[PDB]
């Protein structure tokens, strides 16, 4: 079973800074990785599919990169609404997949 | 004369799984030893027929269905299987009598930056019947409002490109599959072993 | 915004059974890759089951036999029969429609398996 490791567990940043999130896969999954955003009390929101393609309606500040076993999600400028829990899901057997543990973005 | 088997196996381009290519072999003398004794055939499954005794049987007709799929989708090329490829791309009957052969074509089907020339059908209104082909590119209406043959919200193009790259695991690397179907119909036999 | 609405989730005794129901407004559930996902309270998400547009259904190894995903093509409803529920099966069950560039999750229906 593929297990995805997300670091850092919590990412403390000021609004406007650049946030970089990491998701390491135990097996080579190519570009089949998906990034979700979950506000508290809301369902996950699809941000990036195929580890690089930005989902429709997502602001341009979100940008995914990496391949094989090292994927990252980069937020150019953390907005007031960009503080959430970000999940990476390997979709090597789409629509099936295993999620990451999440990388919460919290400062104070 | 001898059969075109190694003209099917050594073909330079294999068809997309959604448009698999069928070759009919008849009035022939089939030598399956060369197929059964070639190194790269990492998968050689025979259903309803023994691979070693194949030379001791003659059939009215033989078909060779060749296509390219991912490594992890090779498990679906077998009777009774279901999934992405069995349902919409290439279905084998439960009473299939033949052999399924697959080998990794990473060195020749993968391009750096992606080989998007191989496509498959991932949406269909219903499963395929065994040995059925569906090469229609009509937009798949997954919604309620008729979207008038233009890809948009809730209606997609049913064909998805594989996008192989030289890297990726063995499960995501291209695999060249050729399925041999042996047929008997009460008509005179035409493909023997010796 | 595409709305998928779950239902049928609530309190149930351990060893009991539940049948969550999912329906959508502007899409036909019989034509979409409809999956079921859950998020255990204070834990990460977990993918449970999927039913293909053609009718093929797949489950996680830990749920085969217990959970049974189906649908009613006439009612436009997706079901998830849940049998022999344990306390660990408590979670918020999402009904997510899968497309290559889209993934529409429902609000989620809480299932509490406790005495």
Author numbering:
A (entry chain L): 1 to 108
B (entry chain A): 334 to 527
C (entry chain H): 1 to 115
What does the original paper state about this entry?
We now describe the isolation and characterization of a human monoclonal antibody, 19-77, with a broad but incomplete SARS-CoV-2 neutralization profile. Structural analysis revealed that 19-77 recognized the spike RBD in the “up” position, and its epitope overlapped with the ACE2 footprint. Structural analyses and mutational scanning led to the construction of engineered antibody variants, 19-77Δ, with a single amino acid substitution at residue R71 in the framework region 3 of the heavy chain.
To further understand the resistance mechanism of L455F/F456L mutations to the neutralization by 19-77, we determined the structure of 19-77 Fab in complex with the RBD of EG.5.1 by X-ray crystallography, as well as the cryo-EM structures of the D614G RBD and the HK. Additionally, the L455F mutation in HK.3 introduced a minor van der Waals clash with P100HC. Given the minor to moderate steric clashes between the RBDs of resistant viruses and 19-77, we explored the possibility of optimizing the antibody to accommodate the resistance mutations. Utilizing in silico modeling and the energy-calculation algorithm FoldX, we performed saturation mutagenesis on each residue of the heavy chain, comparing the binding energy changes (ΔΔG) between each mutant and the original 19-77 in complex with the HK. RBD that contained the L455F/F456L mutations.
